[PDB]
Amino acid sequence: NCPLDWLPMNGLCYKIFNQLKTWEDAEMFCRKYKPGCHLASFHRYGESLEIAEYISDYHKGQENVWIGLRDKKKDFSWEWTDRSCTDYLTWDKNQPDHYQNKEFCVELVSLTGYRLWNDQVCESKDAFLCQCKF
Amino acid sequence: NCPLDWLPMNGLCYKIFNQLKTWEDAEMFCRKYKPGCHLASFHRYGESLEIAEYISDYHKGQENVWIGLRDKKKDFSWEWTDRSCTDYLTWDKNQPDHYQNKEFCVELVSLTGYRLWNDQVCESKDAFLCQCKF
Amino acid sequence: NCPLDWLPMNGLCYKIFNQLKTWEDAEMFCRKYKPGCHLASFHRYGESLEIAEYISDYHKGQENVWIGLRDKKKDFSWEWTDRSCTDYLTWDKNQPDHYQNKEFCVELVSLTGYRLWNDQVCESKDAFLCQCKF
Amino acid sequence: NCPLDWLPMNGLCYKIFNQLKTWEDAEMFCRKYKPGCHLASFHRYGESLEIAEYISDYHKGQENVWIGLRDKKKDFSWEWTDRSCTDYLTWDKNQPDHYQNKEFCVELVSLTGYRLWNDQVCESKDAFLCQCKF
Amino acid sequence: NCPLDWLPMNGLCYKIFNQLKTWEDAEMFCRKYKPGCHLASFHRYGESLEIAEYISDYHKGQENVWIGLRDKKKDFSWEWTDRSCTDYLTWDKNQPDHYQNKEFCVELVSLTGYRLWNDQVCESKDAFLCQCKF
Amino acid sequence: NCPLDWLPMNGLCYKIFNQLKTWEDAEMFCRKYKPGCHLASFHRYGESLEIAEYISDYHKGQENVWIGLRDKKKDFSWEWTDRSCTDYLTWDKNQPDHYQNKEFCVELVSLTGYRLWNDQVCESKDAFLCQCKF
Amino acid sequence: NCPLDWLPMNGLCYKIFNQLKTWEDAEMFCRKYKPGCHLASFHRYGESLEIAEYISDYHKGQENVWIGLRDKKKDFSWEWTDRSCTDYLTWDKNQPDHYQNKEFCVELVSLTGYRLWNDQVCESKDAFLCQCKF
Amino acid sequence: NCPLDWLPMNGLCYKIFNQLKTWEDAEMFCRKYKPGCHLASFHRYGESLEIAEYISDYHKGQENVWIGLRDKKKDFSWEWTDRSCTDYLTWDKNQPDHYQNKEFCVELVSLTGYRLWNDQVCESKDAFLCQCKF
Amino acid sequence: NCPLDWLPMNGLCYKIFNQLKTWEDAEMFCRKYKPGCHLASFHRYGESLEIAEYISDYHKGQENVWIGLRDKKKDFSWEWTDRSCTDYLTWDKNQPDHYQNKEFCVELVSLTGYRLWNDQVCESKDAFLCQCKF
Amino acid sequence: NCPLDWLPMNGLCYKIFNQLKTWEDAEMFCRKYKPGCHLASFHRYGESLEIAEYISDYHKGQENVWIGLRDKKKDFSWEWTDRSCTDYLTWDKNQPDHYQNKEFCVELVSLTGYRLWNDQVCESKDAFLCQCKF
Ligand SMILES: OC[C@H]1O[C@@H](S[C@@H]2O[C@H](CO)[C@H](O)[C@H](O)[C@H]2O)[C@H](O)[C@@H](O)[C@H]1O
Ligand SMILES: OC[C@H]1O[C@@H](S[C@@H]2O[C@H](CO)[C@H](O)[C@H](O)[C@H]2O)[C@H](O)[C@@H](O)[C@H]1O
Ligand SMILES: OC[C@H]1O[C@@H](O)[C@H](O)[C@@H](O)[C@H]1O
Ligand SMILES: OC[C@H]1O[C@@H](O)[C@H](O)[C@@H](O)[C@H]1O
Ligand SMILES: OC[C@H]1O[C@@H](O)[C@H](O)[C@@H](O)[C@H]1O
Ligand SMILES: OC[C@H]1O[C@@H](O)[C@H](O)[C@@H](O)[C@H]1O
Ligand SMILES: OC[C@H]1O[C@@H](O)[C@H](O)[C@@H](O)[C@H]1O
Ligand SMILES: OC[C@H]1O[C@@H](O)[C@H](O)[C@@H](O)[C@H]1O
Ligand SMILES: [Ca+2]
Ligand SMILES: [Ca+2]
Ligand SMILES: [Ca+2]
Ligand SMILES: [Ca+2]
Ligand SMILES: [Ca+2]
Ligand SMILES: [Ca+2]
Ligand SMILES: [Ca+2]
Ligand SMILES: [Ca+2]
Ligand SMILES: [Ca+2]
Ligand SMILES: [Ca+2]
Ligand code: NA
Ligand code: NA
Ligand code: NA
Ligand code: NA
Ligand code: NA
Ligand code: NA
Ligand code: NA
Ligand code: NA
Ligand code: NA
Ligand code: NA
């Protein structure tokens, strides 16, 4: 059960925000939105499609979207900000790759209908997917 | 738990919309009604009965009802829009048939009291059953 | 959770309506109150007692109360209108009997503190117990 | 989950009403407050403590509080009006005593911080603790 | 479910209040915020991390945070005010110490990122973390 | 799971023994069959039907069956020997009656198909129904 | 969990016996096999296929097989001997029909690979499907 | 589920060993009987009664029985060796008394039917009650 | 819970059999190993990993492993023999292909460490993974 | 339920093996003990304590104990061999540190009562905790 403008999915609620922010700020906005929120985390193929479809339908934009997967210790060591060990990974073709050794934040590729992930420059200004418990 | 004009059923909420739309526009209407909605999917006889009765009682019309099953690959591969599994099919007599090879979207047949399905011209305009998670 | 004027019980909500109706009108009235409602069905001893005391305190009357149990094929094959599973029967003394071969609808016997059931003439006017999913 | 002015506790909702009433009236006030309410029943030391602390903080008064325990048959066979089992008792010192054969209704004693029980004349006016299923 | 501005966590709802109060007044303020609230109790590693992060982001201050742990008997016998079991302790380095034999109330230590506890003078003014059941 | 020759029922295991014993000896025999056994207690309609049918088929006799219900205080205050709650009673017609003020033990009545109970002289010899946790 | 020669399926265990018996005797054998057994009952399409496949694989014969569905009051009023109201029915083409007014016991049609049911002469000597709880 | 000579109770298995040992040895005997065993801890009146009755029937002797409660710090801070919470206490009359400052280990008193507890000299030889997770 | 030489995984038990058989004979061997068995079906990445590792560790060979997925209608309609749903596919590079239109049965590819699948000549002789419910 | 010489805990079974092995050999030893075993992983405070006391009573030694936590990519990206979810970490004081840049395997520090963890040289010989699904 969630607010009517959020996507209910397996116990949690999701929502894309169209305000562009770096990954760091996206996490902080979700965190400061309401207590118990973070950038979204995925844990099963089913959710990726559901979220992708939802974003495609409600994202008032065309820009990619930040999710809660960032490689803190720079070396393909990703963790979910919602503290739920990485047990799922639907990486896009030829991704990740730390392009120029300056990309450690996963984003949903808009070209892939948001069905494929991609390591990105955390400083990039994308839209983001918050996830909350209400 | 669902809104007062929706039908609570096995974790989901269902509602017939008397508005006539093509299958496509019906799915899209459900998807944009609120996040987490699709044309209803069915997975047990009990649901067909409940919904059939629901529709008979609440549908302000006599038209057939679109549901989320459509043969996207036009080769009898029926798939639910909510990505649920096709483990239940209650086809009406002689259906599906792909009449004039222009019928790939499923509807609830009015004459059957909305209990059996039939492939129909996706272009047809029927009422529809939305299914949502709240 | 139910509306404040309903009785929450084992997942469903119940309510006595003091309007006197025929079994059939009572059923249809419940069905049209909101999607997912029927004459109440029982499945355990505790519910009978619960309901019995409920009705006694809220029934602005003295009449019997219709419930969703009815012998559709007039042969002692009782079925609940909510299609719930018929696995509990708290018949009153010497019931059912299909008295005069014209009693096929079940009511809560007011003289048994609304705890025992009696097959009755479906056209009799009784108060009724609706049961809904909210 | 309960209304904001009610105390949620092990599935039920409790509330002290400061209005003074006889046991019988307190019971009927709860019963008619909303379907599924009774004078509260207690089932573990934890509940006595939570309730005792709740009443001390919210009770606007100093009177004892009626609870759903009563000796209907006057043989020290205490029963809860909510038909729950008498699987826990926390009588005050020297109670229950059926003082002068005129006390068969149980109240939480204000002098014990509302922790302990005392059989009281049912005709006494006490504040009361309702318990409801919402 | 919790009010939209609270932290939903394992069945309970939490919220930091930035008003500075003594431990005693923090408890009372929580208890009087609505029936069923107390200073928070902790029972798992996850709750400490979740709470610690929630406080880091929403605490409009830099002060320590009172919690429901206190040593009523002043002999290192810590009890939670919500009467839950003391089955989890995350003491800061060299704590508890009953410093100067005046510290009997527990607080989340700001310097530990609100992850570790310290027994403190109950008369000290800190922000506080309430925990309610709604 | 129960030993392959016992009746698995709602978490417990039941077995009728055809040896004729007094109520007291039936209890003791159950208690000494293995730790955790007692004369059976009943708590639902389904258990009465299931037990009644099980006894009709496996009872190598025609005698009545002792069960764990007894009136220790001899004042119609029936308690189960397994100390479970007396929340379900299925007394035969005109029972219990403390006949001749000597009947304080309960038995399943053969003539009722072992569905209904009767208080009986504890010194009477009946077959008995044990209930064990394995 | 079941014995290694039984088919575990949704909480219960199933097993075809090759001894031919009338429906009445099949029920009595299953009942007398171990306490808590009856002729099998089906409640979902999934089970029918699973049972059909299992029977096809382990049935040391070619004869049809009795299941726990019999029309006691002769008039298309079937009930499951395991007392679980009829909520599923996968009747074979042109079945039932009380052929000659002397057929009220459902059997699994061997020609249909045991995937289709059929009303039969309860006196017929078929193999049977027991179902137990262990 | 437990071995046949053990008492199943609320998830654990209990057993009285008639061998007389000091508290410490009893604890270590349980601990080494099999991984996950300790002297028993009690958490509700029901358990005291079940256990008391169990010991009276199976204990081959008349000696008191050690249980996992001990005052490690000798300040009346009783703790269970199985680290379960001390959320229930049923001391015998005039106990615990740290008689002569030499009693810090708890035993079930034989004179009370093994229902009540007494702090005893840890060096005393008692029978003991183990508790295991199988 | 499974036999000691089987791999417990999400309610089911799996085991590789080093015996070489055609896909068909592998399914049949599983089906006749004990009721309730089929060639394993997969529904999550976690299972592929667990089984892949299991096979690497326990498979006494170097051959590929048959699993229950087969395109029965030779038109890329993959179906699990255990009738589970095809909601997970981890095809190996360039697969499936229907090489020489004579490959319709799936196997776990050895060179991929038994993590990815490939359509193969059902007539091939591979080792196989049985899946059973015990 | 586990073998009598294992520790049942939260769905899994655990056992310390006093054979001193390298982290890698300990893992493989567990993997080959029976399908579904790995070096143990932890996820909650209670397990640490449970295991800690378990090992202390059964470890025929003094060495540290290997657990399934290891930093595969030598960059502080710790992962459990059972692929379970990495969401709990009870590191010892100043750990992890990758001392000399050669410690990438985790052990239960014997000096911390086997409660805290230490990243260690994978080639060190330690005792180990296996974890299995039975
Ligand atoms: O008419 C007064 C008596 O009614 C019966 S109950 C009544 O019984 C008839 C058959 O005799 C039909 O089943 C009805 O449906 C049923 O309501 C009571 O048992 C008696 O005590 C009188 O009250
Ligand atoms: O060597 C004795 C001290 O050991 C440390 S623990 C030890 O610390 C080193 C780095 O200093 C590495 O992390 C090792 O992996 C780790 O085991 C204790 O903290 C001290 O008390 C001494 O016991
Ligand atoms: O006769 C063929 C046609 O039958 C109709 O009943 C149906 O609406 C069409 O979809 C088509 O199947
Ligand atoms: O004198 C005995 C009296 O003691 C009082 O404390 C109590 O309220 C009365 O009910 C009565 O029992
Ligand atoms: O030196 C001891 C003191 O240490 C401080 O850090 C703490 O705030 C005090 O509560 C007291 O424990
Ligand atoms: O007449 C009263 C008697 O009725 C019998 O049927 C019963 O066995 C006795 O227990 C007693 O109740
Ligand atoms: O004299 C006091 C004594 O009372 C006994 O009943 C008890 O076993 C002893 O532990 C001690 O307390
Ligand atoms: O190149 C085509 C072939 O590739 C092989 O690796 C595979 O085993 C065959 O099934 C076929 O797909
Ligand atoms: Ca990139
Ligand atoms: Ca058609
Ligand atoms: Ca009647
Ligand atoms: Ca009194
Ligand atoms: Ca301190
Ligand atoms: Ca009697
Ligand atoms: Ca026929
Ligand atoms: Ca003592
Ligand atoms: Ca291929
Ligand atoms: Ca280290
Ligand atoms: Na998520
Ligand atoms: Na659906
Ligand atoms: Na009902
Ligand atoms: Na209560
Ligand atoms: Na808490
Ligand atoms: Na029982
Ligand atoms: Na069945
Ligand atoms: Na215990
Ligand atoms: Na599977
Ligand atoms: Na683990």
- Token pair belonging to C8: 């929450």
Resolution in A: 2.3
Kindly give, in sequence order, each residue whose CB lies less than 8 Å from that of residue C108, ignoring residues fewer than 6 positions away: C51, C52, C55, C64, C65, C67, C114, C115, C116, C117, C129
Query: What residues of B form the annotated binding site for Ca(2+)?
Result: 95, 97, 103, 118-119
Q: Which ligand is nearest to the CA of E85?
A: 23
Cβ I134 under 6 angstroms from ligand 8: no
Distance of CA G90 to the CA centre of its chain: 12
Report d(CA C107, CA C127) in Å as an integer. Answer: 9
Answer for the pair J126, J64: CB distance below 8 angstroms, yes or no.
Answer: yes
Answer for the pair H6, H13: CB distance below 8 angstroms, yes or no.
Answer: yes
Instruction: Determine the Cα angle at E83 with ends E82 and E89, to 5°.
Output: 90
Provide the 10 A C-beta neighbour count for residue G5. 10
For chain B, state the CA radius of gyration. 13
- Token pair belonging to J87: 């969401």
Nearest-10 crossing angle of helices G23-33, F45-58: 100
Amino acid at D9: M
Q: Which of I117, I13, I14 is nearest to I64 (CA)?
A: I117
Kindly give, in sequence order, each residue whose CB lies less than 8 Å from that of residue J86, ignoring residues fewer than 6 positions away: A85, A86, J41, J69, J78, J79, J80
Instruction: Determine the Cα angle at J16 with ends J15 and J22, to 5°.
Output: 125
Amino acid at F16: I
Report d(CA F81, CA I25) in Å as an integer. Answer: 56
Atom 12 of ligand 4, nearest CA residue: D99
Report d(CA F64, CA F113) in Å as an integer. Answer: 10
- Token pair belonging to A105: 């934040």
Report d(CA B121, CA I122) in Å as an integer. Answer: 39
Q: What is the dihedral of CA G3, G9, G14, G15, to 10 degrees?
A: -70
CB-nearest to A73 from J77, J79, J86 is J77
Diameter of chain H measured on Cα atoms: 42
CA distances from A119 to A41, A54, A68, D28 (A): 15, 21, 12, 65
Chains G and F contact (Cβ–Cβ under 8 Å for 3 or more pairs): yes
DSSP B6-70: SEEETTEEEEEEEEEE-HHHHHHHHHTTSTTEEE----SHHHHHHHHHHHHHH-SSSS-EEEEEE
Nearest-10 crossing angle of helices F23-33, H45-58: 90
Element (H, E) at I92: none
Q: What single-letter DSSP state applies at residue F7?
A: E
Q: What single-letter DSSP state applies at residue D91?
A: B
- Give C57→chain G minimum CA distance, Å: 32
Hey, are the CB atoms on C4 and D34 less than 8 Å from each other? Answer: yes
- Token pair belonging to A99: 């392009």
Work out the burial of residue F60: count CB atoms within 10 Å of its CB; fewer than 13 is exposed, 13-18 middle, 19 or more buried.
exposed
Kindly give, in sequence order, each residue whose CB lies less than 8 Å from that of residue H88, ignoring residues fewer than 6 positions away: H42, H43, H44, H45, H47
Answer for the pair J50, J7: CB distance below 8 angstroms, yes or no.
Answer: yes
User: Sign (positive/negative) of CA torsion C119, C125, C130, D2?
Assistant: negative
Report d(CA C93, CA C109) in Å as an integer. Answer: 10
Report d(CA J40, CA J56) in Å as an integer. Answer: 16
Report d(CA D34, CA B21) in Å as an integer. Answer: 44
Element (H, E) at A20: strand A12-21
Kindly give, in sequence order, each residue whose CB lies less than 8 Å from that of residue E63, ignoring residues fewer than 6 positions away: E20, E110, E125, E126, E127
Q: Which of F110, F25, F118, F112 is nearest to F71 (CA)?
A: F118
Q: Report yes or no: I115 at the J interface, CB cutoff 8 Å.
A: no
Pairing of strands G65-70, G126-132: parallel
Q: What single-letter DSSP state applies at residue J91?
A: B
Reduced to 3 states (helix: H, G, I; strand: E, B; else coil), residue C23 is helix
Report d(CA J9, CA I105) in Å as an integer. Answer: 40
Burial annotation J96-109 (CB, 10 A radius, 16+ → b, else e):
beeeeeebbbbbbb
Instruction: Determine the Cα angle at G101 with ends G98 and G107, to 5°.
Output: 35
Kindly give, in sequence order, each residue whose CB lies less than 8 Å from that of residue B127, ignoring residues fewer than 6 positions away: B16, B17, B18, B19, B20, B59, B61, B63, B64, B65, B66
User: Sign (positive/negative) of CA torsion G75, G81, G86, G88?
Assistant: negative
Hey, are the CB atoms on C57 and D134 less than 8 Å from each other? Answer: no
- Token pair belonging to C82: 């909510």
Q: Which ligand is nearest to the CA of C126?
A: 1
Report d(CA A21, CA A30) in Å as an integer. Answer: 11
Q: Which of H69, H97, H103, H107 to mutate to test the pocket of ligand 7 (most atoms within 8 A of CB)?
A: H97
Reduced to 3 states (helix: H, G, I; strand: E, B; else coil), residue A13 is strand
Alpha carbons within 13 angstroms on the beta-carbon side of residue G45 total: 11
Report d(CA A128, CA A110) in Å as an integer. Answer: 12
Answer for the pair A9, A50: CB distance below 8 angstroms, yes or no.
Answer: yes
In chain I the domains, ranked by start, together with CATH numbers, are: 1-134 (3.10.100.10)
Amino acid at F131: Q
Element (H, E) at E23: helix E23-33
Alpha carbons within 13 angstroms on the beta-carbon side of residue H32 total: 11
Report d(CA F111, CA H49) in Å as an integer. Answer: 35
Q: Which of B133, B92, B108 is nearest to B26 (CA)?
A: B108
Kindly give, in sequence order, each residue whose CB lies less than 8 Å from that of residue C40, ignoring residues fewer than 6 positions away: C12, C14, C51, C67, C68, C82, C129, C130, C131
Residue with tokens 């070619």: G62
Beta carbon pairs, B and I, within 8 Å: 5
DSSP D45-68: HHHHHHHHHHHHHH-SS---EEEE
- Token pair belonging to D110: 């204000």
Answer for the pair D122, D28: CB distance below 8 angstroms, yes or no.
Answer: no
Answer for the pair F34, F132: CB distance below 8 angstroms, yes or no.
Answer: yes
DSSP H42-111: --SHHHHHHHHHHHHHH-SS---EEEEEE-TTSSS--EETT--------BPTT----GGG-EEEEEE-GG
Provide the 10 A C-beta neighbour count for residue A108. 30
- Token pair belonging to I133: 């419910």
| Interface test with chain H among E41, E74, E77, by most H beta carbons within 10 Å | E77
CA distances from C119 to C14, C97, C109, J9 (A): 21, 7, 10, 54
Chains E and D contact (Cβ–Cβ under 8 Å for 3 or more pairs): yes
G97 is in an annotated binding site: yes
Q: Which of D60, D55, D56 is nearest to D20 (CA)?
A: D60
Distance of CA J14 to the CA centre of its chain: 10
Cβ J45 under 6 angstroms from ligand 2: no
Provide the 10 A C-beta neighbour count for residue I43. 16
Element (H, E) at D15: strand D12-21
Q: Per 3-state DSSP, what percentage of chain G is helix, strand, and coil (rounded to 5)? A: 25, 30, 50
Distance from residue C125's CA to the centre of ligand 24 (Å): 41
Report d(CA D95, CA D109) in Å as an integer. Answer: 11
Element (H, E) at E122: none
Answer for the pair F103, F96: CB distance below 8 angstroms, yes or no.
Answer: yes
Neighbours of chain I (3+ CB pairs under 8 A): A, B, G, J
Answer for the pair C82, C106: CB distance below 8 angstroms, yes or no.
Answer: no
CA distances from J22 to E110, J29, J52, J125 (A): 41, 10, 20, 5
Reduced to 3 states (helix: H, G, I; strand: E, B; else coil), residue B96 is coil
Q: Report yes or no: A50 at the B interface, CB cutoff 8 Å.
A: yes
Cβ C93 under 6 angstroms from ligand 1: yes
Please state the atom number of ligand 5 nearest to the C-alpha of residue E118: 10
Q: Which of E113, E12, E32 is nearest to E65 (CA)?
A: E113
Report d(CA G129, CA D122) in Å as an integer. Answer: 61
Q: What single-letter DSSP state applies at residue D92?
A: P
**Could you write out the three-class secondary structure of A42-84?**
CCCHHHHHHHHHHHHHHCCCCCCEEEEEECCCCCCCCEECCCC
- Token pair belonging to J53: 């006391």
Work out the burial of residue D82: count CB atoms within 10 Å of its CB; fewer than 13 is exposed, 13-18 middle, 19 or more buried.
buried
Answer for the pair F132, F13: CB distance below 8 angstroms, yes or no.
Answer: yes
Q: Which of C38, C126, C123 is nearest to C82 (CA)?
A: C38
Report d(CA D35, CA D95) in Å as an integer. Answer: 32
Provide the 10 A C-beta neighbour count for residue H11. 7
- Token pair belonging to H27: 């604890």
Element (H, E) at F54: helix F45-58
Answer for the pair I134, I29: CB distance below 8 angstroms, yes or no.
Answer: no
Instruction: Determine the Cα angle at H34 with ends H31 and H37, to 5°.
Output: 45
Residue with tokens 């040391």: G60
Neighbours of chain A (3+ CB pairs under 8 A): B, E, I, J
Q: Which of A57, A58, A42, A134 is nearest to A91 (CA)?
A: A42
Q: Report yes or no: H15 at the F interface, CB cutoff 8 Å.
A: yes
Amino acid at B101: N
Q: Which of J8, I4, J43 is nearest to H35 (CA)?
A: J8
